[PDB]
Amino acid sequence: PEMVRGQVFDVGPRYTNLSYIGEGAYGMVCSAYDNVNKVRVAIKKISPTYCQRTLREIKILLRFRHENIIGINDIIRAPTIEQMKDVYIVQDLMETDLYKLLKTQHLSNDHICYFLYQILRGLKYIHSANVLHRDLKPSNLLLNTTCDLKICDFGLARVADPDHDHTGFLTEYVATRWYRAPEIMLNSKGYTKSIDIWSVGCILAEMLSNRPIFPGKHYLDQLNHILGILGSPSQEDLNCIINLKARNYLLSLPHKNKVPWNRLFPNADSKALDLLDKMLTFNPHKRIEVEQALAHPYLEQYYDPSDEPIAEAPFLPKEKLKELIFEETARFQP
Numbered sequence: 390p391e392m393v394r395g396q397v398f399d400v401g402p403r404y405t406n407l408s409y410i411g412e413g414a415y416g417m418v419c420s421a422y423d424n425v426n427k428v429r430v431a432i433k434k435i436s437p438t439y440c441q442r443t444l445r446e447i448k449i450l451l452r453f454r455h456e457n458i459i460g461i462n463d464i465i466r467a468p469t470i471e472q473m474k475d476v477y478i479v480q481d482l483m484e485t486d487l488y489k490l491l492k493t494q495h496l497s498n499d500h501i502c503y504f505l506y507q508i509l510r511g512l513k514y515i516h517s518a519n520v521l522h523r524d525l526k527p528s529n530l531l532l533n534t535t536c537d538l539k540i541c542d543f544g545l546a547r548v549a550d551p552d553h554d555h556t557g558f559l560t561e562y563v564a565t566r567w568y569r570a571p572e573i574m575l576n577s578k579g580y581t582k583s584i585d586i587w588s589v590g591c592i593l594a595e596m597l598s599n600r601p602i603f604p605g606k607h608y609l610d611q612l613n614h615i616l617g618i619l620g621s622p623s624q625e626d627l628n629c630i631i632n633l634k635a636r637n638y639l640l641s642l643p644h645k646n647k648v649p650w651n652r653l654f655p656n657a658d659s660k661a662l663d664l665l666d667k668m669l670t671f672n673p674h675k676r677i678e679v680e681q682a683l684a685h686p687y688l689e690q691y692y693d694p695s696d697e698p699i700a701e702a703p704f705l706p707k708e709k710l711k712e713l714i715f716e717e718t719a720r721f722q723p
């Protein structure tokens with residue numbers, strides 16, 4: 390079995406000529422030559438007690454089939470549960486991600502427009518399956534050499550459950566802080582589609598300036614960053630927050646005026662800013678939906694609902710989780 394950087398990376402004979410890429414949220418990732426398809430591919434090593442997030446991501450990615458969502462090409466593991474330790478996930482090799490790209494590259498308006506279109510196209514499919522991604526951010530958006538975009542990391546995804554979204558003030562949240570909608574800090578468990586639209590809005594703003602729009606240092610600092618740009622919520626939007634502790638927190642804050650988008654983003658396309666304003670709406674009920682965003686004038690060059698597919702239908706102890714991973718990966722065995 391082959392070795393990479395003082396670590397076992399055992400991908401059968403099918404995958405050779407391993408080259409270390411880096412470390413992802415799961416473990417070691419390499420490129421390798423697929424001797425069947427005659428192309429370089431990416432392979433992620435998953436090592437265990439396994440994570441719930443691994444099972445969730447495998448189930449989702451195997452069910453989904455969309456141009457703007459990363460697929461699983463192959464899964465490598467031992468033939469029995471007793472022998473199953475590591476699991477290797479094989480996927481298309483991508484050139485980069487939008488986190489790395491924004492660290493070093495200015496995007497043209499054309500690239501911003503095209504990336505936003507593809508994010509929203511993928512997200513339409515995800516939401517059409519009644520799934521929420523819940524951790525959209527630049528590092529979860531992959532690009533190939535021709536700027537085709539694919540969404541990854543479904544580890545925090547959940548089935549949408551708007552009837553059970555309400556929670557108390559300051560409820561702990563798992564997803565990446567800078568991309569969290571304001572309602573997460575106030576009264577929301579992140580079980581509605583509007584949670585993802587907020588993240589997309591944050592990503593758009595970050596594409597416009599190469600800097601995160603709301604870089605909060607801690608949980609409640611994230612809300613002051615948001616309010617520092619959007620300004621204080623209106624009486625009507627505050628009245629929508631029925632929880633008293635959340636309401637009264639907002640009432641306790643000094644009045645903050647709105648920072649106009651054209652002042653934050655003086656070189657931005659005006660239609661991009663109109664769409665940004667609609668995605669970064671404080672009140673999640675007033676926030677634009679994925680299909681509306683696709684139909685916005687900014688994306689007129691790309692919008693084509695007949696070419697924006699939707700999903701065919703809507704979507705434990707450690708021993709049971711290991712067993713379900715084994716069962717879920719069975720289709721890749723000969």
Ligand SMILES: *CCC(=O)Nc1nc2c(s1)COCC2
Pocket residue numbers: 410413431480481482483484485486528529530531540541542
């Ligand atoms: C969702 C994060 C993720 O899986 N990132 C990846 N980045 C690359 C991958 S997967 C494969 O191609 C190299 C870059």
Ligand SMILES: *CCC(=O)Nc1nc2c(s1)COCC2
Pocket residue numbers: 625628629630672674675
């Ligand atoms: C107070 C809660 C709230 O703002 N509800 C809303 N419901 C709708 C809105 S705002 C706008 O779109 C129609 C439904």
